[PDB]
Every structure is written in C-alpha cells, then in structure tokens.
Amino acid sequence: QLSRADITTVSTFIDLNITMLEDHEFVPLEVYTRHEIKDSGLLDYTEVQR
Amino acid sequence: YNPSRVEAFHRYGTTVNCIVEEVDARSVYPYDEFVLATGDFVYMSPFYGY
Numbered sequence: 039q040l041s042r043a044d045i046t047t048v049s050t051f052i053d054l055n056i057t058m059l060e061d062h063e064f065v066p067l068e069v070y071t072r073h074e075i076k077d078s079g080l081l082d083y084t085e086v087q088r
Numbered sequence: 089y090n091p092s093r094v095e096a097f098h099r100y101g102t103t104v105n106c107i108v109e110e111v112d113a114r115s116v117y118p119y120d121e122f123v124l125a126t127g128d129f130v131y132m133s134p135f136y137g138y
C-alpha cells in the first residue's frame with residue numbers, strides 16, 4: 039500500500055486567480071478650509087469695527 | 089434748522105431729531121456681544137439680565 043502523494047500529480051483544472059478589491063478609506067481633504075479663505079482677505083470689516 | 093441771516097456774523101443753530109428704528113441684531117459664539125444692522129457693536133451678551 040502506498041500513499042496518495044507518492045505518485046506525481048498534474049492539475050487537470052485551468053486555474054483562475056480572483057483578487058477581491060481591497061477596502062479603501064477616504065480621509066477628509068480640502069485645498070483651503072473655510073477659515074483660510076476668510077483669512078485670505080487683507081482686511082476684515084468685522085474685526086476692524088470691533 | 090439753521091440760524092436766521094444776520095450780516096458779517098457767525099451763528100449756531102442746533103437740531104435734535106429723535107430717531108427710533110427696528111434693526112436686526114446678530115451675534116456669534118461665545119455670544120458675549122452682538123452687532124446691529126447699522127454696524128454698531130454692543131459689548132453685552134444678548135442674554136444678559138438679572
């Protein structure tokens with residue numbers, strides 16, 4: 039009696055590798071926050087009047 | 089009102105016009121002060137009271 043792995047084996051199937059799409063996490067990103075846009079002005083009427 | 093016309097003389101004429109208006113007040117956090125529609129600042133919390 040001999041084991042099943044003692045004889046050479048050939049794959050009769052046509053392998054098809056399937057790599058699922060990895061999960062992705064999106065982080066917040068802004069070129070200019072609303073605070074930066076407000077600060078872009080040279081003068082602010084609110085602060086000047088205050 | 090202005091003074092009556094008297095030759096080569098300076099005159100002072102006072103005018104007092106009572107005015108009452110309904111203005112929209114605005115305030116921001118910490119709400120320690122508020123502004124008026126006329127652009128005048130009021131350094132008092134809108135909720136101040138006894």
Ligand SMILES: *[C@@H]1O[C@H](CO)[C@@H](O)[C@H](O)[C@H]1NC(C)=O
Pocket residue numbers: 053054055
């Ligand atoms: C992936 O597919 C290939 C054939 O494209 C196959 O040879 C391989 O054993 C498969 N599995 C792994 C883990 O690479």
